[model samples]
Target: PEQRIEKAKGETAYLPCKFTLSPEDQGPLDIEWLISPSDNQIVDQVIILYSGDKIYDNYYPDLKGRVHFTSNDVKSGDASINVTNLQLSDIGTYQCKVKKAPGVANKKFLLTVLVKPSGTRCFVDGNDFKLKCEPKEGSLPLQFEWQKMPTPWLAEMTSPVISVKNYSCTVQNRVGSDQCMLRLDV
Candidate 1:
């Protein structure tokens, strides 16, 4: 069975794969790590790492400097890797394959990367005010909340703004939140 892992952006994501070798197998084993897009069925596959007689790092540009095998004990069937500086685009499924003399083992992992809200901004045009919040680094579908100082009013609008003296907008998701304030010069 495959396990699910969640990690914040810029953090390390550990994908674990383990297997046991039979006593009959006593030769060097080959281990390969492959990844594909989250929504991919069987296409767009890329090799993440490989180990046997030699070590092969990511052949794909997107993973070149961020992927590596955590241990080199393929003979004992430990095919795990640590991915550093995770990005939202790295959310996908990974496959680990290990082959020995007489048997082969396979494992799977599903990775999710959470991103924090980058920053917030506001704009005022005449009596009409507009507030925009962005999670420039995190995953999509961010929830937006707005609050005005010295007012008893609160809003849950996904995108909200109104003419006022001073107000603040906060953008948040599962990862983190960020806010910005603005004061109209009416």
Candidate 2:
């Protein structure tokens, strides 16, 4: 089955991968975690973590210090992993595979990293004012909300601006939200 997970930038994301094994199968198991692009071709699959007898060195260089196995007890059928320092490029699909005596189990997860808006700019367009929000770093499809102080004016648009005393703009995604304020002297 496939699952969806969301995490904010610079935070840690715990991707859970659980399975079941026979009670009599008391032997070593092989567990691996792999990552690939979600929208593009699957030719660039990279190994993130591997747990086995001794032959290691399967982790990719870009994710060497950022990814780790959450549990060492793969015999117990827990193949979870922890990814730290999340970035916008980390948005992709992850696969956890476990190989046992008689069967193999695999779990897929889709990860999304959210980023908040940073700088905001305001300008006067003839009789009306325009406000723009800038995202320093983050994910896509951001939701924007604008409001005016001392008034009951609220707007939900990408570039929401008006001729008001004070203006506040909030940009948010699945993981987090941020707001910027500006005052116009009309």
Candidate 3:
């Protein structure tokens, strides 16, 4: 499974990138990481190549002390990077570059940070009613499902207290899936 970390604005977001190398390329190797968001803007770079510790230039002050690698050994192939204190400006696509003697691998992934909306409350009286579950207009890949939390004691079908417990919705596309949870009280 791929790794994705979601956090609030000012919270730390960890974007992980793992790679594997051949046996011929062992010990210290070269690893470079940069943020490429469609546009041609190189943000960070590693100038030296080694097995243990690699030095980086402080060219990008925004990510000066925030970017770090989990390990450096090329044989192990753990090219994970940890970014901390994420800001709103950091919401973009990122790429990981790894280079060994005779092989190289790169991967790209997107980091999305979201602030969940506050919970809402609604009141309903005892009555016979029908709820309509309809997808919003212009919403693509929208799915709808209706659910009711019935009381444990009674399984009778009538104008009973079939509490509207929760609603599960999924909006999925080629990119990914976005889920939302809604609750109702009676």
| Sort by TM-score, top down from the best | 1, 2, 3
Per residue, candidate 1 scores C-alpha lDDT tens digits across 157-184 of: 4454453333567777777887877655
**Candidate 3: tens digits of C-alpha lDDT, residues 47-129:** 22233454563545667787666555533657676767766556666667777767777776566655322222222335454
**Candidate 3 Cα deviation (angstroms), residue 181:** 27
Shift of residue 81 alpha carbon in model 1, Å: 0.7
Relative to the true structure, candidate 2 has a C-alpha RMSD (angstroms) of 4.5
Candidate 2 whole-model C-alpha lDDT, 0 to 1: 0.67
Q: Candidate 2: deviation at residue 89, Å?
A: 0.9
lDDT of 3 at 138: 19
**Worst ten-residue run, lDDT, model 1?**
149-158
Instruction: Write down the worst ten-residue block by lDDT for model 3.
Output: 116-125
User: Model 2, 111-158: lDDT tens per residue?
Assistant: 887765555444444344444555565455777776654433443344
* Superposed model 2: Cα runs more than 4 Å off: 23-28, 39-41, 54-58, 122-131, 138-175, 181-186
- For each of the candidates, give the backbone clash count: 1, 0, 1
Best by lDDT: 1
